[PDB]
């Protein structure tokens, strides 16, 4: 059966005895059957690549993989080579001799090349059209793959005019199933992907959900709070106190927009008896490395940071993530809040919302969009930037499951919140606080 082959090739070539996840498996099987175009939207470290690489080995012919830049392309080729897989890369960073060695290999009946990584520039160039023409005619194309598929959308962050030719490409390669992959797609970006690449219905979709059961999402209104600083300390004390025998157990992050706010919030927290240190661009590199160190090694349980917080920094027992100030985007909030509870254990994610904060950020977004518009003219992404903020304001100012609002933005199914946010745990108490906010709104 096909399962017997796929399991076997997974083991013999790639080395694994079972797939990471049954979603990775399902995607993989759907590409193998080859009746449908496929969209795979999984985050970094999911093994999204396996879902087109493994099926490529099990087919009769060649798999063209279109990736936007060679840095990306190169990583894959080296690893595939190490697995003793017959891979090749066609780019304009290559000598005429290497280029022509490869163009030649492709014009063979039964080429050496099983998988061909190619840049969009090259996949459109006159130099390649005839090679492609011969490959289709000899029925040697098993699959067209488009990586970083989101680049085709003007509503995505990384638009490339290059990618607009890919739809015409897909059309010519009609007989061949098309796979498109990315980590990052709003529903609007997914609709742009399916349209612009001319994917064919039914498009089968494999999309890792945002939802993490062990995170508890809630919003507090700084306007309706006598001791904001004191509220925060209690939130930190709850979160850090889930093993009283150890005393303080775990660590937490407080996120601020400004450096002044960091320094101040660190001092306020420290006084009320929760040891906290400020991390921002203001400090010397040495102070930063020392503060990061103290947090990582649990000397100091709480770090107060600007957007500067390290990408390479991933800790396992982050018991809470407090946004003192609303973030620039729903995506930013998801990512920053999502640094919590990577060890699977219960964690708390809290947004401190003020309309004054909303207004300060709202404006700063529009200012830095204006500064980009003077340097490169208009872009439909500028509209996306503003709507990315609206979605987070809407998260704060509506009644409804917090996890569900996050899922609607990203395009997931309604998640299984087990009284896992404020609204699901007590709907009426949320209505109370929302009503209370609207009383200040009068006039």
């Amino acid at each position, epitope marked *: 059966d096909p399962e017997r082959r796929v399991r076997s090739t997974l083991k013999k070539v790639f080395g694994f005895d079972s797939f990471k996840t049954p*979603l990775q498996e399902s995607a993989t099987m759907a590409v193998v059957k080859g009746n449908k175009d496929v969209f795979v939207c999984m985050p970094t470290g999911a093994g999204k690549s396996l879902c087109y690489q493994l099926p490529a080995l099990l087919a009769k012919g060649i798999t063209i993989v279109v990736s936007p830049l060679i840095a990306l392309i190169q990583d894959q080729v080296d690893h595939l080579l190490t697995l003793k897989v017959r891979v090749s890369s066609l780019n304009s960073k290559l000598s005429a001799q290497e280029r022509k060695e490869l163009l030649a290999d492709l014009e063979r009946e039964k080429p050496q090349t099983k998988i061909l990584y190619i840049t969009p520039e090259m996949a459109a160039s006159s130099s390649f059209q005839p090679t492609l023409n011969s490959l289709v005619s000899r029925h040697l194309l098993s699959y067209l793959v488009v990586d970083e598929a989101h680049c085709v959308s003007q509503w995505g962050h990384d638009f490339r005019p290059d990618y607009l030719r890919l739809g015409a490409l897909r059309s010519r390669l009609g007989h061949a199933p098309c796979v498109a992959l990315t980590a990052t797609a709003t529903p609007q970006v997914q*609709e742009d992907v399916f349209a612009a690449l001319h994917l064919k219905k*039914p*498009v089968a979709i494999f*999309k*890792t959900p945002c939802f993490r059961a062990n995170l508890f999402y809630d919003v507090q209104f700084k306007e309706l709070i006598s001791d904001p600083y004191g509220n925060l300390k209690d939130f930190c004390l709850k979160a850090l106190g889930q093993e009283a025998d150890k005393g303080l157990s775990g660590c937490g992050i407080v996120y601020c927009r400004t450096r002044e706010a960091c320094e101040q919030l660190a001092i306020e927290l420290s006084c009320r008896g929760v040891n906290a240190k400020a991390y921002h661009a203001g400090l010397k590199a040495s102070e930063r490395t020392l503060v990061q160190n103290d947090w990582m090694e649990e000397k100091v349980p709480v770090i107060v940071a600007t957007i500067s917080f390290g990408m390479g920094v991933d800790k396992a027992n982050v018991r809470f993530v407090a946004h003192w100030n609303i973030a620039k985007s729903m995506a930013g909030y998801y990512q920053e809040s999502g640094r919590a509870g990577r060890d699977g254990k219960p964690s708390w994610c809290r947004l401190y919302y003020s309309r004054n904060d909303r207004d300060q950020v709202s404006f700063l977004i529009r200012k830095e969009v204006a500064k980009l518009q003077e340097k490169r003219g208009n872009k439909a992404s500028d509209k996306a930037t503003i709507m990315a903020f609206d979605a987070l304001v809407t998260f704060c100012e509506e009644l409804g499951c917090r996890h569900a609002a996050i899922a609607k933005y990203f395009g997931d*199914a309604l998640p299984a919140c087990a009284k896992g946010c404020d609204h699901c745990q007590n709907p009426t108490a949320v209505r109370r606080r929302l009503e209370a906010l609207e009383r200040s709104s009068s006039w």
Partner: nanobody
Amino acid sequence: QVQLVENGGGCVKAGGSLRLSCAASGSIFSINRMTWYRQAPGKEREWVAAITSGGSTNYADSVKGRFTISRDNAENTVYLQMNSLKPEDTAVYYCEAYGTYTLAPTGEGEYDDYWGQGTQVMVS
């Protein structure tokens, strides 16, 4: 897969009124365009009216002001209010679910077009 099942047809007299309901089943997240077509026997399929996700609506000239469509967003269901009916309007009425995004919490979905079963509408 997805079910479109239309309801709320029957026989009524000229000048009378019906309201059709089309119900969409399955894990539907969104529908790009929901569209009302009618098939009069021995005539070509006729485009009636349609509504975008976000509630933009347009209407055939032959039914403008008499007919109006709307969407129970909660229900993933559309309605076609037909008042001032005429013998012309006698037909089978069905819906097209263009750009129908479906998705389970597993992360496994589809994106497809779907067609309805139809409801009979007689105008004396």
